[PDB]
Amino acid sequence: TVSDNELQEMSNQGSKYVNKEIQNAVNGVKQIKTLIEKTNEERKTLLSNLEEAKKKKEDALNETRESETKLKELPGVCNETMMALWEECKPCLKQTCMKFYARVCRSGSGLVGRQLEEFLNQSSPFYFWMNGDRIDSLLENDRQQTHMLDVMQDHFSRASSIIDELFQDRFFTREPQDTYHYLPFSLPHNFHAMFQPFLEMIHEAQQAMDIDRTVCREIRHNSTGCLRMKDQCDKCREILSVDCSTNNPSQAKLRRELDESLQVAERLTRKYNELLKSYQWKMLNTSSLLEQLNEQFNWVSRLANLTQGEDQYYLRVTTVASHTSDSDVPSGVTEVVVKLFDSDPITVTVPVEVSRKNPKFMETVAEKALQEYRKKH
Ligand SMILES: *[C@@H]1O[C@H](CO)[C@@H](O[C@@H]2O[C@H](CO)[C@@H](O[C@@H]3O[C@H](CO)[C@@H](O)[C@H](O)[C@@H]3O)[C@H](O)[C@H]2NC(C)=O)[C@H](O)[C@H]1NC(C)=O
Ligand SMILES: *[C@@H]1O[C@H](CO)[C@@H](O[C@@H]2O[C@H](CO)[C@@H](O)[C@H](O)[C@H]2NC(C)=O)[C@H](O)[C@H]1NC(C)=O
Ligand SMILES: *[C@@H]1O[C@H](CO)[C@@H](O)[C@H](O)[C@H]1NC(C)=O
Ligand SMILES: *[C@@H]1O[C@H](CO)[C@@H](O)[C@H](O)[C@H]1NC(C)=O
Ligand SMILES: *[C@@H]1O[C@H](CO)[C@@H](O)[C@H](O)[C@H]1NC(C)=O
Ligand SMILES: *[C@@H]1O[C@H](CO)[C@@H](O)[C@H](O)[C@H]1NC(C)=O
């Protein structure tokens, strides 16, 4: 029973909130620019944290490495029971890792066990006694970290270069027009010739940024991952318990010096990995923000080419209805059918508190309808 004259006034009223979107849209672009530039500075101060943290880690590693070379100058095994535990440690390790890879991981259990037995035969129980596995598994982790930062940093600096060049345009500089509440908003006269350069630069930055199941990957990569399971086997934790204090007191002291430097180096390596993980998030954030910037610029452009025609309503209200009229409508809402930019009719649901005698009725309808329209492309 809604008068056509009212539907027309709703169309007049709703069409004027389309011009507020073009303004809001440009602000969304400029607000995203702020967040990207904010994250960029947070990345830089994080990089300065990594450069301080790298030195401390590196110094701790040279002291650890300086310690293991002095323990290889004295390479003999003190107890001769060690040599007999080695040939009962080795078979046990092979089985516990094979059993793991088959149960937890995948196929190739025997392949892993073979690669391990071969390496353990080219190995000695002294290497175990001096925690030689932990030294190697730390020095390699240190190199993986150095590589990860090298890659991430160079991906980031390229994208940051493309982005800073894009943000040197004055389209992104805040203007008073963005805050006008009574006077209308107007895009630049040459937006069609600014759209494509910008969008491509956002695409180029998105490209630049683009880079237990964990143990299974490692055991597949190198069978030495099995040596994380020394604890499970008895003879091996006994090789590690051997006191050489009576037999070779000089070896025992150097081993205690190494273990000290080892724990420090590991602490500072876990600290570096947490900063690296924080840097990774800044990288993902920036990729997430660039995707928004793309969707926002398209929305501005989409709005721009659709609103240049003033011959008919931007938003035309076709029907208003309630649970009285349709009765398929839910009870506490009214449904407004809308033809936005002469596209397929969009249906909007607004609660009766905003529907009945509310001046923010058509502001709600228009904002909702435009949100749906935006989703459609
Ligand atoms: C790494 O070195 C060890 C040395 O202990 C190799 O294990 C040894 O392998 C030989 C032959 O492969 C075994 O000899 C056989 O023993 C059985 C039962 O004792 C006997 O019936 C056979 O006639 C033969 O004498 C030996 O026992 C075994 N020792 C241990 C402690 O396992 C191992 O094969 C080497 N790894 C590689 C990849 O070569
Ligand atoms: C060689 O190693 C064995 C074990 O690795 C040592 O045996 C230990 O001896 C003490 C003293 O009798 C016992 O209390 C421990 O329980 C033994 N450990 C094990 C695992 O059996 C042995 O003392 C070492 N020999 C030398 C000369 O250091
Ligand atoms: C440890 O060696 C690395 C590589 O040469 C170097 O970066 C670091 O400064 C060294 N630390 C010390 C204390 O010499
Ligand atoms: C596995 O690790 C050992 C020592 O950590 C190394 O000598 C060997 O080359 C590694 N193998 C592979 C395939 O990475
Ligand atoms: C952004 O970074 C923070 C910490 O740097 C992280 O907690 C958050 O998950 C990141 N968000 C995205 C979308 O990557
Ligand atoms: C808007 O229309 C122009 C052509 O008039 C076109 O080049 C541009 O890609 C359109 N933008 C969107 C988001 O559809």
Residue numbers in the entry: 25 to 213, 239 to 260, 281 to 446
Direct quotes from the study:
Clusterin (apolipoprotein J), a conserved glycoprotein abundant in blood and cerebrospinal fluid, functions as a molecular chaperone and apolipoprotein. The Clu structure is composed of three domains, a coiled-coil (CC) domain, a small helical domain containing all disulfide bridges (hereafter disulfide domain, DD) and a C-terminal α/β roll-like (AB) domain. Structure-based mutational analysis demonstrated that two disordered, hydrophobic peptide tails enable diverse activities. Resembling the substrate-binding regions of small heat-shock proteins, these sequences mediate clusterin’s chaperone function in suppressing amyloid-β, tau and α-synuclein aggregation.
